[PDB]
Every structure is written in C-alpha cells, then in structure tokens.
C-alpha cells in the first residue's frame, strides 16, 4: 500500500521499466544493475569499432563499469560476514545484493517499491541458490521492519533522489548498529554552481526524481548521527562510461544531460561513506 501519491508514481515507474540498456547489460553475467559506471574504458577488449561484434563488446564493457561502481561502493562497507545483516535501500532488480552476498556472505535484505523488481530479484536469488540469505521485499525504505540496531551496514546506490534525505538518514541511523557503516553513491547538484541547472532539471523530469544538492546530503547526515569518513568526487571517473554509452545503439536520450552537466560543473557524481555513531 503506497505511502504517498509520489511513491505510487515511483512503484508504477519501476513496475513498467524494462529498457534494453539495463536488461541486455544484466544478461552479460546475470547481475542486473540500475546505476551508472566508473573507471577507465578497456579499449583493448573493445577492439575495432568497425568489427561485427563491436556493439556486444560495448555492452560487456558498459556492464563491467556498472559492476565496478558497485564494487567500489562495497569497498567502503567495512568488514561484514555470515552473521551480519546488510540492507540495500531501493534495491532494484538485485544485482548489488548478489554481489554483496558473494563478497561478504552476509544476510542481504533489499527493499524496493516495485513488486516486479522484488519478484525478479527473488527469482534470481533462487536460481543462484542463495535465497536463504538474499531477499527483496516491497517496502518503503523510509519505514522498514528492521529492528533498531540490527543492521551492520547499508547503502543507497542511486536511490536517494526519491526521498527526503533527513527521513532517509533517520531511518538508516535507526536500524544501523552503533559503529555500523553507511554508503551512498549519488548524483547531486553542485552547490558551487548555485541551484539545479536546466540539465539537472531535465534528469529529474526524465526519471521523475528529485536530485538533492551536495550541501543537503551532508546536512542531513550531520543531523542524523551519520559521519562521513570518505567522500570521493567520482565525476571524472564516470565520464568515460557516459562517453562510451553515448556511442551505443542502446542510448536512452538522457546521455547529453549527464555529460554536459558533469562537464559544466552543475552536476556531480559522488560517493559518501559514513559511520553511524
Ligand atoms: N521510498 C522507496 N522505498 C524503497 N525503494 C525505493 C523508494 N524510492 C525509490 N526506490 C527504489 O529505488 C531504486 C532506484 S534504481 C537503483 C537500484 C539499485 N540500488 C541498483 O543500484 O541497481 C528503484 O528500485 C526504486 O524502486
Ligand atoms: C541522478 C542519478 C545518478 C540517477 C538518476 C535516477 C535514476 C533512477 C537513474 C536510472 S539508472 P537505470 O535505471 O539503470 O537507467 P538507464 O540505464 O536506463 O538510463
Ligand atoms: Mg542502467
């Protein structure tokens, strides 16, 4: 039962989504991601752009960068093991959850507003025989069933732009144990630019989302017991992914808004990793 009209819009959006730039990339190795990539492009793997198999090599390379982005996120989760619970807040089709369970062996709990996504991820988990440890549910991430202090680490990978940040961080702070760890990778508008540019607004309109400024991320963390220990401006790191993607037949039309706003300083891609204290 949707918490607000807006969250009903978001459930409907993701229930309806199935773009090739997501499913064909996930098909490469069965890790289905809904986030962007980081790191240098492997031009050797790509080979000659004129080759018959170029588009398939581009697909494998873009997917490799999107998985690299998740790995980088998890490098900031600290240590976790089989007796711990990890929470993926706004978990998509569950590729990050699969990777986390492989990396840490923990119980991994995902929440999403989309029944089609939860169903997809739970089917994937059963296929991989890790469904006793990895579970998606349809649940608003601002109001979860996890007990106070029960969670060792948690994250939002490109899902914070659908909620009020004070409410989101109050919720993670509630369920994270003292000394637990939080990470987010997000696109935030740059308060140095001053307000959201036209490009940022085009991205909001495209995804029905609400990009926050970097100032708001840090303010909401400070107000909710979450203290950053690492912040990385990944903007230069994600541009190669976007410039490569822009050459792909699977483009969605938002590539220019990301590239141009990254280049002009109005928009930035950032990792913030924090302790719950
Ligand atoms: N209030 C809310 N509660 C739970 N999930 C939410 C939410 N608002 C948005 N979402 C989820 O946020 C996700 C954005 S897509 C990113 C998915 C995933 N973290 C990945 O990196 O692949 C979607 O799954 C959407 O359902
Ligand atoms: C501002 C940022 C970083 C993201 C905007 C919100 C959002 C849901 C982007 C979608 S990621 P995904 O569903 O994987 O999108 P596409 O590849 O189809 O463009
Ligand atoms: Mg995608």
Swiss-Prot record:
Q: What is its EC number?
A: 2.1.1.255
Gene Ontology MF: a single term: C-methyltransferase activity
Q: Which GO terms describe its biological process?
A: methylation; terpene metabolic process
Cofactor(s) needed for function: Mg(2+)
* Reactions that this protein is recorded to catalyse: (2E)-geranyl diphosphate + S-adenosyl-L-methionine = (E)-2-methylgeranyl diphosphate + S-adenosyl-L-homocysteine + H(+)
List the InterPro entries: Erg6_SMT_methyltransf, GPPMT_Stmyces, Methyltransf_11, SAM-dependent_MTases_sf
Alphabetical UniProt keywords: Magnesium, Methyltransferase, S-adenosyl-L-methionine, Transferase
Q: What class of enzyme is it?
A: transferase
Q: Which domain of life is it from?
A: Bacteria
Output the Pfam families linked to this UniProt entry: Methyltransf_11
Q: Report the protein's function.
A: Catalyzes the SAM-dependent methylation of geranyl diphosphate (GPP) to yield (E)-2-methylgeranyl diphosphate (2-MeGPP).
So what family is this one in?
Belongs to the geranyl diphosphate 2-C-methyltransferase family.
* The protein's name: Geranyl diphosphate 2-C-methyltransferase
For this protein's source organism, the top of the classification is:
Bacteria, Bacillati, Actinomycetota, Actinomycetes, Kitasatosporales
């Amino acid at each position: 039962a949707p918490a607000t009209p807006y969250q009903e819009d978001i459930a409907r959006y993701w229930n309806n989504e199935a773009r090739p730039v997501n499913l064909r990339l996930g098909d490469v190795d069965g890790l289905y991601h809904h986030h962007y990539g980081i790191g240098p492009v492997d031009r050797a793997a790509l080979g000659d752009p004129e080759h018959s198999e170029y588009e398939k090599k581009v697909i494998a390379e873009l997917h490799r960068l999107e998985s690299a982005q998740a790995e980088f996120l998890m490098d900031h989760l600290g240590q976790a093991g089989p007796d711990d619970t990890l929470v993926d807040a706004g978990c998509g089709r569950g590729g990050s959850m699969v990777m986390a369970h492989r990396r840490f062996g923990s119980r991994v709990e995902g929440v999403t507003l989309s029944a089609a996504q939860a169903d997809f991820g739970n089917r994937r988990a059963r296929e991989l025989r890790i469904d006793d440890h990895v579970r998606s549910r349809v649940c608003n991430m601002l109001d979860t069933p996890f007990d106070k202090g029960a969670v060792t680490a948690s994250w939002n990978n490109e899902s914070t732009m659908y909620v009020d940040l004070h409410d989101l961080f109050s919720e993670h702070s509630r369920f994270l144990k003292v000394g637990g760890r939080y990470v987010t990778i997000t696109g935030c508008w740059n308060p140095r630019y001053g307000q959201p540019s036209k490009w940022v607004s085009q991205i909001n309109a495209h995804f029905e989302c609400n990009i926050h400024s970097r100032r708001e991320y840090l303010r909401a963390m400070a107000d909710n017991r979450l203290v950053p220990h690492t912040i990385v401006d990944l903007t230069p790191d994600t541009l190669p992914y976007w410039e490569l993607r822009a050459t792909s037949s699977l483009v969605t039309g938002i590539e220019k808004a990301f590239i141009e706003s990254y280049r002009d300083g109005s928009f930035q891609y950032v990792l913030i990793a924090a302790d719950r204290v």
